[PDB]
Amino acid sequence: SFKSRALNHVKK
Amino acid sequence: KGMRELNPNDIDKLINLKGLVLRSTPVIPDMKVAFFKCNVCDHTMAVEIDRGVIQEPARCERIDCNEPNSMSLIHNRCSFADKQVIKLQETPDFVPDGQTPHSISLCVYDELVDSCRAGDRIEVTGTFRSIPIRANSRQRVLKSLYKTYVDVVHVKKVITDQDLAKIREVAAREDLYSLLARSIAPSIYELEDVKKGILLQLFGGTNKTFTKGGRYRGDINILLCGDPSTSKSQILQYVHKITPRGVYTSGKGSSAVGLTAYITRDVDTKQLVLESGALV
Ligand SMILES: Nc1ncnc2c1ncn2[C@@H]1O[C@H](COP(=O)(O)OP(=O)(O)O)[C@@H](O)[C@H]1O
Ligand SMILES: [Mg+2]
Ligand SMILES: [Zn+2]
């Protein structure tokens, strides 16, 4: 229904 | 060169100036190297500044993280330098026909900051630069008239063992008192006692730091009262030249407040300040 992307805190 | 002889031809060339310092702004921090941190991956990078422009990055420089427009400036981690702006007034002699003397602004960075005080005669070498003035804050539009100023690169404010060995030789002279008393005021004739008294004032007594009480100062006060035509004012001027600090105040030309201190306000800072009188 929608397009979303996610950024993870562990990536820091 | 004179402050009234700088033409457009002499722009971006090394010139030499001399004048009197009128006022200097406080230290201004000038950015040298900027510091950017990625809001996502917390990656830090430093970028240089060219011609007053930050070479900001469009996106994070890391390969794994490439989020655009996620970089932010950390204000308190960027390297900074010292900047100061001075106003120089041309020497009174250069004034052709008694008008308001012209003034030229100067910029000094790093070591030369806080090198010249207000009310001092200096000789400055620097680049005669020119820079546009923006017509308004919120546009790139520029005025056609350029502001002129000087980028200072050098400032000159206008004991060795051999001298000490020389000085110690005079002290051995038996007639040292007469020598100094005769050299303090060469022109005045047959006033040896007056000269001697004047000399002992220059040396002064001995300083004492004294707790359980108050400080005791070895300063000597001398009064020279006598017949008019005798050399009184001449000795006053002669001593006024020798001493490193002093004010030639006269009678009926000075006020009670004028001697001690005057209460005033600073327009630039809008704060209550006090000036130093003749005695101070
Ligand atoms: N002993 C002296 N040595 C040198 N100059 C003298 C002497 N006596 C008088 N004069 C001259 O007389 C003038 C006295 O004027 P001034 O010193 O102004 O007197 P006062 O300041 O006491 O009114 C000086 O210009 C000085 O040249
Ligand atoms: Mg006099
Ligand atoms: Zn990043």
The residues, any chain, with a CB within 8 Å of residue B65's CB and separated by 6 or more, are: A11, B38, B40, B41, B43
Q: How far apart are CA B36 and CA B39, in angstroms?
A: 9
B86 and B105 Cβ atoms separated by less than 8 Å: yes
Whether ligand 1 lies within 6 angstroms of the CB of B234 is answered as yes
Q: How far apart are CA B27 and CA B176, in angstroms?
A: 49
Q: In this complex, how many residue pairs, one in chain A and one in chain B, have their CB atoms less than 8 Å apart? A: 9
Closest B-chain CA to A10: B41
The residues, any chain, with a CB within 8 Å of residue B20's CB and separated by 6 or more, are: B88, B89, B90, B91, B119, B120, B121, B122
From residue B196, give the alpha-carbon distance in Å to each of A3, B76, B148, B240, B241.
Answer: 99, 62, 55, 16, 17
Residues of A in contact with B42 (CB under 8 A): 12
Ligand nearest to the CA of B37: 3
Q: Hunting for tokens 């520029």 — which residue is that?
A: B142
> Which secondary-structure segment (H or E) carries B33?
strand B28-38
Resolution (A): 3.5
Here the tokens at position A3 are 């397009």
Ligand 3 being an ion, which residues bring their Cβ within 5 A of it? B 38, 41, 43, 60, 62, 65
Here the tokens at position B206 are 């001995």
Going by CA atoms, what residue is nearest to atom 19 of ligand 1?
A: B229
CB atoms within 10 A of CB B210: 9
E strands present in chain B = 14-24, 28-38, 44-50, 53-54, 71-73, 79-89, 103-109, 121-131, 147-157, 261-266, 271-276
Q: Which residues pair with B21 in a beta bridge?
A: B88
Going by CA atoms, what residue is nearest to atom 11 of ligand 1?
A: B231
Alpha helix ranges (H) inside B84-160: none
B21 and B87 Cβ atoms separated by less than 8 Å: yes
Q: How far apart are CA B31 and CA B33, in angstroms?
A: 6
Obtained via which technique? cryo-EM
Q: Which residues pair with B271 in a beta bridge?
A: B266
Q: How far apart are CA B27 and CA B107, in angstroms?
A: 11
CB-CB under 8 Å, B67 with A11: no
The shortest C-alpha distance from B116 to chain A (Å) reads: 50
